[PDB]
Amino acid sequence: MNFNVGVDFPSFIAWDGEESFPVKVDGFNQFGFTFKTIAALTAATTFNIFYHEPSDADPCVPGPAIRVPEVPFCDTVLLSEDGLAAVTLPETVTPDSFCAGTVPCMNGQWISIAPATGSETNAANVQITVTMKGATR
């Protein structure tokens, strides 16, 4: 007895493994990511996060990709030495499982994920999707 859960927390494709897709978030208030490995990797895979702004030409087309900073909570001591949030799927992840993730403070209108340089050939074997939460507008 599954509901029409398309509406009431839909989702979109963020990273097919070959290219990213900026996705709007304004309609909702909360959101998170979902990572899926299609094959066994060879090293930890780092992905930088980026947010976009409505291009001045069209108020609902994403502009460039500004990199969102990193926010430490209470016991975070790593700080990623750059304060520019990025997420690294660790090596040895079984290709029948998933992992969650999110940024605690949003900024802009669109979200995009791009594999950090050097670890981009394993990105060809990963799929990242995004889910939202209840509707604001």
């Binding site: 208030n29 939460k133 209840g134 509707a135 604001t136």
Partner: protein, 52 residues
């Protein structure tokens, strides 16, 4: 969070007489929206020597 009525929609029609039948029409739509709150904070320092 709260509820909202998109539109009641049409529910019935002017059929002709002598027909033991009817139509289903169109149901409405009931969206369920939600919102968050926000914070607003500030700080300020001193020297405690000018405060005396």
């Amino acid at each position: 969070t709260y509820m909202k009525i998109a539109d009641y929609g049409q529910l019935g029609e002017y059929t002709c007489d002598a027909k033991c039948d009817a139509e289903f029409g169109e149901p409405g739509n009931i969206r369920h929206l939600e919102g968050k709150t926000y914070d607003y904070r500030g700080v300020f320092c001193f020297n405690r020597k000018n405060l005396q």
